[PDB]
């Protein structure tokens, strides 16, 4: 009786990682996102795989 009508509005938000995130692993291991450098900084593999 209080409201003759009700209107629900739904909004969906995307989400990428941010500095300081919470990594998880079923091996129990937990990780906190520290820093991401330019892919140059990553050591190159024998095939150059950074």
């Amino acid at each position: 009786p209080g409201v003759l009508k009700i209107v629900k509005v739904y909004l969906a938000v995307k989400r990428r990682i941010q500095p300081g995130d919470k990594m998880a692993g079923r091996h129990g291991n937990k990780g906190v996102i520290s820093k991401i450098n330019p892919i140059e900084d990553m050591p190159y593999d024998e095939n150059g795989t950074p």
């Binding site: 409201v3 209107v7 509005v9 739904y10």
Partner: peptide
Amino acid sequence: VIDVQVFTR
């Protein structure tokens, strides 16, 4: 806003 819902008595 993906969508909404409105309910009127």
